[PDB]
Symmetry: D2
Subunit: 186 residues, 4 copies
């Protein structure tokens, strides 16, 4: 049939841009988010979503933009956990319930961020989330093989989107994190 893509968080930002570049006559591109009635942080909602989608080829997760900023000593832990619930656990749930529907040659592309490795004050929540995502990405790449699992690590929306396509298209890549940060890590 057609190659089916699922872009969670793909209603806006990078997600939307990627969805646009994926739209063709030979593909089906599902996008979902809080806007479309998917709470990626809620397991039953995530399970529901993938039940309505069925078998597809490539899963992309970009959801999770908010996080409380400030020093560890100041930042409210409840807000921090709420940040974790969406960007980290959201990805975990997505992989957990999406995986069984991936067709042969399928892939999962998660999203971390440079803050996983660039040490910046005020950003422990984002750094912790991203570091966890990158560790989980590699365990998944191992457990789910031959299903490929990679992460894009952002620092133009089209240049970021290009990295996802590359993850989706390269059949020899798995368990890797691709930095697209315009040299912020330097």
């Amino acid at each position: 049939d057609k190659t089916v893509y699922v872009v969670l968080g793909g209603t806006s930002g990078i997600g939307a841009e990627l969805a646009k570049q994926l739209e063709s006559e030979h593909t089906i591109v599902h996008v979902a988010s809080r806007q479309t009635g998917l709470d990626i942080s809620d397991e039953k909602s995530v399970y529901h979503y993938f039940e309505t989608i069925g078998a597809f080829d490539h899963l992309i997760v970009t959801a999770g933009s908010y996080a409380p900023a400030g020093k560890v000593v100041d930042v409210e832990v409840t807000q921090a956990k709420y940040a974790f619930d969406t960007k980290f656990w959201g990805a975990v749930l997505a992989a957990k319930h999406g995986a069984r529907y991936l067709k042969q040659g399928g892939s999962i592309t998660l999203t971390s961020g440079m803050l996983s490795r660039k040490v910046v004050a005020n950003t422990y929540v984002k750094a912790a989330i991203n570091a966890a995502i990158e560790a989980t990405t590699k365990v998944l790449a191992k457990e789910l093989a031959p299903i490929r699992v990679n992460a894009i690590s952002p620092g133009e929306a089209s240049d970021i989107a290009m990295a996802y396509l590359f993850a989706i298209q390269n059949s020899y890549m798995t368990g890797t994190v691709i930095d697209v940060d315009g040299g912020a890590l330097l």
Copy 2:
């Protein structure tokens, strides 16, 4: 004029061995854990605990031992989150509320684990927790300067033995005594990371 230590999870395992070694004519060593009525995953408890301790010199967190093993697709997420609450958020809470009482020249030493970097099937909860601790360790180190913050990353082999508690404890003592070290992660894994 004694140097004061707090070891969270210092009632057993690495913490207990480290607490013994820290005991001396010039030190006071407070140990706390579930056994002593401290729930490190609860902010109220942790906030109150440090209230009773007052100003001290070195904080060491070794607590949070359990995590549900298994594939990502199999592991119950609530259990995963619960493990996160204790080891990771426990360390965050300890640092968040412990930092205020640290005397000048003091330090915080956290515990991660080799699984943060050694990719092993069925260990995504520990891998994620440890990776998170190490990233947070470095942020803390930057924000708390001149207070030093480091992490010890224990392993279970090239060395031909399994790690003794005193070998791990030695790493903590090194972090505590070396005042030119902050924001580092000290591996003591018997070479397991070499795979």
Copy 3:
């Protein structure tokens, strides 16, 4: 005008595959190696080459592939230094003398390899070289901005039983195809927001 590519080591292997994919009617693809009279380990030979080419857009270095296998205690140091001279110092010489000729929006893409981080007995020369390449990539990326500098880090790429032995252990289930690796170069070349990065394409070998 036409976009100009220089692929050092592009007369065979990964480089040859990449040169074929870059080949088109609106591009100019220069390939060179020992076969074409370029000794990338010899500074005056590298200087000569870029004088003949002049201004161009993208430099890709895949040159140098041999290194003595074995333990540190056994490997003849003189052979190690020779391998270093080609793959590492060759890349340094290519960037040093090629840089001034890169047009606006140009880039440099070097080649390391998984052995920079996958710890494998008997491979210290390759590991050392690749670790050196990747550290140098990032310093370059910083000194040459806005010229972009990145590095591709391939795993095993396509006796028959050795391939079967590998495939079985690789998460992807197959051994690298030359074009799988070349795709990564094309991505580094086309992505104007990527610099200072190392791109792993190793079929999951780094996972252990």
Copy 4:
């Protein structure tokens, strides 16, 4: 009966400080370098040196590099720095290993620049990256001989020395790189 230490680069700086801390009634501490006539970048010279030492327990290598942009630095100078620090370490490990007693170790020196990206420092960065990668292969090949690296920043010499001592004393540590950079890696 005593424990024997060899510190290449031990006549000054970190090496000298470490040698001071290792000296005691129950140890023997050999120090060597250019100052004592040892040329660590010369294979024959390193080989012969260990002949004079014989069996021992712990080798420590703490043994300049041209600063400048990659486009500016003279490559023969860059190669000369590599000869002394990287290949010097390789030669020390290569010819000193067979002499190491049971429970012995090798501790090399890299530096934060292997991982802190700084303009004008490509030679040091490349050297320290090479060291840290070679360190881990060695730790794997030489097991159960332990092999670690100390990575200093641009600090107090005794604090750096403490890191070496820690590497030497911990029997459960091999293939690791210990940062004692005073927070410089944090940026």
